[PDB]
Write a protein that binds this ligand. Structure first.
Ligand code: 4IP
Length: 100
């Protein structure tokens, strides 16, 4: 563990094709990356939180505990296993945004 870092699985909705896939997310500094899985050598995408305008809870999904990250180019919809896990991600992400 390292303060400011977090890694774990989250389910996310696709862009054009809105299928939900379980991906491994890692947060270090201001980079939020997601991989196919925990042992994936390379990320599918590297998101820079300096471009993120907000992180908010999302109550409009099929999954109960979801939140989204808003970027000018796209809003990502992610869901955690529990409200607790969702809160952990939301709190650390907002914390990141607060220092930006
Ligand atoms: O796997 P299928 O059912 O074909 O649907 C894919 C996955 O949801 C992708 O997620 P992942 O990349 O995690 O595999 C997603 O890319 P994102 O990563 O941008 O969400 C694609 O969005 P579009 O490329 O926008 O259609 C979507 O077409």
């Amino acid at each position: 563990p390292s303060l400011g870092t977090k890694e774990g699985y989250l389910t996310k909705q696709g862009g054009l094709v809105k299928t939900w896939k379980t991906r491994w997310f890692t947060l270090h500094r201001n980079e939020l990356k997601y991989f196919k899985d925990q042992m994936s050598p390379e990320p599918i995408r590297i998101l820079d939180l300096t471009e993120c305008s907000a992180v908010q809870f999302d109550y409009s999904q099929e999954r109960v505990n979801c939140f989204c990250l808003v970027f000018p180019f796209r809003t990502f919809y992610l869901c955690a296993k529990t409200g607790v896990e969702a809160d952990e991600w939301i709190k650390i992400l907002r914390w990141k945004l607060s220092q930006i």
